[PDB]
Design a protein around this nucleic acid. Structure first.
Lengths: 41, 215
DNA sequence: ACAGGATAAAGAGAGAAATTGAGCCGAGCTTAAGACCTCCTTTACCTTTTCA
């Protein structure tokens, strides 16, 4: 079970190296239909 | 739980690629474990292609000359042992060169099949003078690791895609003993250093997987 | 070493002063909600210009 745990640690160690290596929010405020006062502020 | 990051990547003129990776955080002693295992696997257990044998029209021995060709058989053989090729099929291939006349014979003159790619297209092979014809036949095989030897001239092919591996272990202590692995990989261009690293990791994972679920 | 003598410079005795802190209060002070008055903005509709 120590051999198994060591192998598990090694597999988890080399695993990350195996393969690792909205439109509404872009709207200009002009489309918000704000009041001319709020818009201008 | 660590993060591998390619700090630098280069493509030298000879088409030989280079890469450096930082792997951290690693526990104390794990940097050496990972670095040494990766180095051994990269340099010894990656598959590649190289010119295994060659036949030259007009010669029969390594210590022989070719009329009109500045180099002799030995220089051409050494210049061809470092010719870098990459095959897409597990079947051995044969390329044919037949340059003639005044010319500088480079790697591009080799008429490999569609399945063989010459990584460096201008790799000096020989220099033909006036009224000289160099007739050459090259055999490409699939192997692993530098393989010395005991019709076709047998060659000491270099199947290694990876040319050089170095690693250093630093200390990423924030404030225990954490380690950081810096791995430098030089490849001949047949594989990118990230593909070589990926294949080495695949070999190691495949080695350590069966040692987990039973014993 | 020891005894006598002269003296000044440094402690104890007391109250009266001066502070002092302590409780016990209500006067000064702050907090928060709501209302409430200037200042400003922007509109809808105009009048009033300079010009083809």
């Amino acid at each position: 079970e120590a051999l198994s745990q060591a192998a598990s640690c090694l597999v988890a160690l080399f695993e990350p190296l195996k393969n690792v290596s909205t439109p509404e929010s872009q709207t200009p405020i002009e489309d918000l239909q704000l009041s001319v006062r709020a818009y201008n502020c | 739980t660590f993060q591998v990051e390619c700090v630098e990547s280069r493509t030298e003129a000879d088409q030989g690629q280079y890469g450096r990776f930082s792997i951290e955080p690693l526990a104390r002693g794990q940097g050496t474990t990972v670095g040494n295992a990766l180095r051994r696997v990269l340099l010894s257990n990656l598959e590649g292609t190289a010119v295994t044998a060659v036949r030259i029209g007009g010669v029969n021995h390594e210590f022989a000359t070719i009329p009109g060709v500045r180099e002799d058989v030995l220089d051409i053989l050494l210049n061809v042992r470092e010719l870098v090729v990459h095959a897409h099929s597990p079947q051995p291939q044969i390329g044919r060169l037949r340059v003639v006349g005044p010319a500088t014979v480079t790697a591009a003159d080799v008429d490999f099949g569609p399945e063989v790619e010459v990584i460096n297209p201008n790799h000096y092979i020989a220099s033909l003078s006036e009224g000289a014809t160099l007739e050459m036949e090259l055999k490409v095989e699939w192997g692993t690791g530098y393989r010395a030897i005991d019709d076709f001239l047998q060659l000491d092919a270099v199947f290694m895609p990876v040319r050089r591996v170095n690693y250093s272990v630093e200390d990423a202590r924030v404030g225990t003993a954490i380690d950081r692995l810096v791995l430098e990989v030089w490849t001949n261009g047949s594989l990118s250093p990230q593909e070589a690293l990926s294949q080495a990791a695949s070999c190691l994972v495949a080695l350590f997987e069966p040692l987990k679920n039973v014993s």
